[PDB]
Scaffold this active site. Structure first.
Site, short mmCIF file in Angstrom:
data_model
loop_
_atom_site.label_atom_id
_atom_site.label_comp_id
_atom_site.label_asym_id
_atom_site.label_seq_id
_atom_site.Cartn_x
_atom_site.Cartn_y
_atom_site.Cartn_z
N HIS A 61 0.82 -1.22 0.00
CA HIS A 61 0.00 0.00 0.00
C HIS A 61 0.85 1.27 0.00
O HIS A 61 0.33 2.38 -0.15
CB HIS A 61 -0.95 0.01 1.21
CG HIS A 61 -0.25 -0.12 2.52
ND1 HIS A 61 0.18 0.98 3.25
CD2 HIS A 61 0.11 -1.21 3.24
CE1 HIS A 61 0.76 0.56 4.36
NE2 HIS A 61 0.73 -0.76 4.38
N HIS A 64 8.30 2.01 2.76
CA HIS A 64 8.92 2.54 3.97
C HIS A 64 10.43 2.54 3.84
O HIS A 64 11.01 1.62 3.23
CB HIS A 64 8.55 1.71 5.20
CG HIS A 64 7.09 1.75 5.57
ND1 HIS A 64 6.52 0.85 6.44
CD2 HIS A 64 6.09 2.57 5.17
CE1 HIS A 64 5.24 1.12 6.58
NE2 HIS A 64 4.95 2.17 5.82
N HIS A 91 8.06 7.55 5.62
CA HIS A 91 7.28 7.16 4.44
C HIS A 91 6.42 8.34 4.01
O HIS A 91 6.44 9.40 4.66
CB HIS A 91 6.37 5.97 4.77
CG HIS A 91 5.38 6.25 5.86
ND1 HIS A 91 5.68 6.11 7.19
CD2 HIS A 91 4.10 6.69 5.80
CE1 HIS A 91 4.63 6.45 7.92
NE2 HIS A 91 3.66 6.81 7.10
N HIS A 93 2.48 9.66 2.11
CA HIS A 93 1.16 9.37 1.60
C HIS A 93 0.92 10.29 0.41
O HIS A 93 1.47 11.40 0.36
CB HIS A 93 0.08 9.62 2.65
CG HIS A 93 0.22 8.78 3.87
ND1 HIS A 93 -0.56 7.66 4.10
CD2 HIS A 93 1.05 8.88 4.94
CE1 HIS A 93 -0.23 7.12 5.26
NE2 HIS A 93 0.74 7.84 5.79
N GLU A 103 -2.67 13.77 4.29
CA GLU A 103 -3.60 13.18 5.25
C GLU A 103 -4.18 14.27 6.14
O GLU A 103 -5.41 14.44 6.23
CB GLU A 103 -2.91 12.08 6.06
CG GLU A 103 -2.59 10.88 5.19
CD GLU A 103 -2.56 9.58 5.95
OE1 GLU A 103 -1.74 9.45 6.88
OE2 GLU A 103 -3.36 8.68 5.60
N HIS A 116 5.75 11.46 6.55
CA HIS A 116 5.71 11.02 7.96
C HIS A 116 7.06 10.45 8.42
O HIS A 116 7.58 9.53 7.81
CB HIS A 116 4.62 9.97 8.15
CG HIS A 116 3.23 10.52 8.04
ND1 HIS A 116 2.14 9.73 7.79
CD2 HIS A 116 2.77 11.79 8.15
CE1 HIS A 116 1.05 10.48 7.76
NE2 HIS A 116 1.41 11.74 7.95
N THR A 196 -2.49 6.25 11.15
CA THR A 196 -3.51 6.62 10.15
C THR A 196 -3.98 5.44 9.28
O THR A 196 -4.83 5.61 8.40
CB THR A 196 -3.03 7.76 9.23
OG1 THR A 196 -1.87 7.34 8.51
CG2 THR A 196 -2.73 9.02 10.05
N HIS A 197 -3.43 4.26 9.54
CA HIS A 197 -3.96 3.04 8.94
C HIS A 197 -3.92 1.88 9.95
O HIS A 197 -3.31 2.04 11.02
CB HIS A 197 -3.32 2.71 7.57
CG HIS A 197 -1.84 2.44 7.62
ND1 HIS A 197 -1.30 1.39 8.33
CD2 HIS A 197 -0.81 3.03 6.97
CE1 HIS A 197 0.01 1.38 8.16
NE2 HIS A 197 0.34 2.36 7.33
N1 LIG Z 1 0.91 6.79 8.90
S1 LIG Z 1 1.53 6.68 10.37
O1 LIG Z 1 0.44 6.74 11.30
O2 LIG Z 1 2.57 7.66 10.48
C1 LIG Z 1 2.30 5.10 10.57
C2 LIG Z 1 3.19 4.91 11.61
C3 LIG Z 1 3.88 3.71 11.71
C4 LIG Z 1 3.70 2.71 10.76
C5 LIG Z 1 4.59 1.50 10.78
O3 LIG Z 1 5.77 1.65 11.02
N2 LIG Z 1 4.08 0.31 10.43
C6 LIG Z 1 2.63 0.05 10.32
C7 LIG Z 1 2.36 -1.13 9.40
N3 LIG Z 1 2.98 -2.34 9.95
C8 LIG Z 1 4.36 -2.15 10.42
C9 LIG Z 1 4.53 -2.58 11.88
C10 LIG Z 1 3.93 -1.67 12.93
C11 LIG Z 1 2.64 -1.89 13.40
C12 LIG Z 1 2.10 -1.07 14.38
C13 LIG Z 1 2.84 -0.02 14.89
C14 LIG Z 1 4.12 0.20 14.44
C15 LIG Z 1 4.66 -0.62 13.46
C16 LIG Z 1 5.01 -0.80 10.20
C17 LIG Z 1 2.77 2.91 9.74
C18 LIG Z 1 2.07 4.10 9.64
ZN LIG Z 2 1.87 7.73 7.53
#
Ligand SMILES: NS(=O)(=O)c1ccc(C(=O)N2CCN[C@H](Cc3ccccc3)C2)cc1
Ligand SMILES: [Zn+2]
Length: 257
Positions: A61, A64, A91, A93, A103, A116, A196-197
């Site tokens: 999606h 990173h 990363h 968006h 976002e 982000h 945010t996901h």
């Molecule tokens: N858009 S945002 O809010 O800045 C955001 C912050 C962290 C992450 C992230 O590092 N991951 C999320 C997806 N699975 C992985 C492992 C993981 C899961 C849960 C928390 C951290 C890392 C990596 C994704 C989005």
């Molecule tokens: Zn993000």
């Protein structure tokens, strides 16, 4: 699982993740007339070691850029924090068109993309996995990206994408300091929010820069060129990956300026 298309997208995430309708969801629309200035907010200080950059990964999606997070070589301090936070990834968006893609929005204005930069609380916790679900576990710097002039600082990141075109592909990505991507002014808004996901944990203290950075229309095309499918399947470009803004539910957005 989950995604950004019709059946698995943001509007439906609450079916598998009830917290999606929670009280601390991100992102939000920042209304500048409703923000409260806070004199206790220290300036944001980032000190990143380019030697911690590790790897770039196509996650289906999005993509990173990951950093070695075994010690405090790359840290975020200041702002609303008493604790030091350890950098683990950055990363972006983006959206289907230039007209949307960020976002967070500011006074209803949507930007073309958003950067982000994510950190975990290493003063309080021993690992990212431990920190991830904690109220004070994560800190993310958000930078709004406005379509205009090509951003040369983005180039090394964009150059790396040809090696991770399809889902699951990963490659070394070394010797990079992501503070070079941040705007010159670090004036910010902050609020308590969430990922945010999925899994959408309400574990993030958001730091949103007031100053935008640039990105060209062709640079955005490179993001959208990334493929969500595995190698060998029919190509499915990553057209968009931004979540709609979420209700504030009585939270206050604070301003450092
Ligand atoms: N858009 S945002 O809010 O800045 C955001 C912050 C962290 C992450 C992230 O590092 N991951 C999320 C997806 N699975 C992985 C492992 C993981 C899961 C849960 C928390 C951290 C890392 C990596 C994704 C989005
Ligand atoms: Zn993000």
């Amino acid at each position: 699982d989950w995604g950004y298309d019709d059946k698995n997208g943001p509007e439906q995430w609450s079916k598998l993740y009830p917290i999606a309708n929670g009280n601390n969801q991100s992102p939000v629309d920042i209304k500048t007339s409703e923000t409260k200035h806070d004199t206790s907010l220290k300036p944001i200080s980032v000190s990143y070691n380019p030697a911690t950059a590790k790897e770039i990964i196509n996650v289906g999606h999005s993509f990173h850029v990951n950093f070695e997070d075994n010690d405090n070589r790359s840290v975020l301090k200041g702002g609303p924090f008493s604790d030091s936070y350890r950098l683990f990834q950055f990363h972006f968006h983006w959206g289907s068109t230039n007209e949307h893609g960020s976002e967070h929005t500011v006074d209803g204005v949507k930007y073309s993309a958003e950067l982000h930069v994510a950190h975990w609380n290493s003063a309080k916790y021993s690992s990212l996995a431990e920190a991830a679900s904690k109220a004070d576990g994560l800190a993310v710097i958000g930078v709004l990206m406005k379509v205009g002039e090509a951003n040369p600082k983005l180039q090394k990141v964009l150059d790396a994408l040809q090696a991770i075109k399809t889902k699951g592909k990963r490659a070394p990505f070394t010797n990079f300091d992501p503070s070079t991507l941040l705007p010159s002014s670090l004036d910010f808004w902050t609020y308590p929010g969430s990922l945010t996901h999925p899994p959408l944990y309400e574990s993030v203290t958001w730091i949103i820069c007031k100053e935008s950075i640039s990105v060209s229309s062709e640079q955005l095309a490179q993001f959208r060129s990334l493929l969500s499918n595995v190698e060998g399947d029919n190509a499915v470009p990553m057209q968009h990956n931004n979540r709609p803004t979420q209700p504030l539910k009585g939270r206050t957005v604070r301003a450092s300026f």
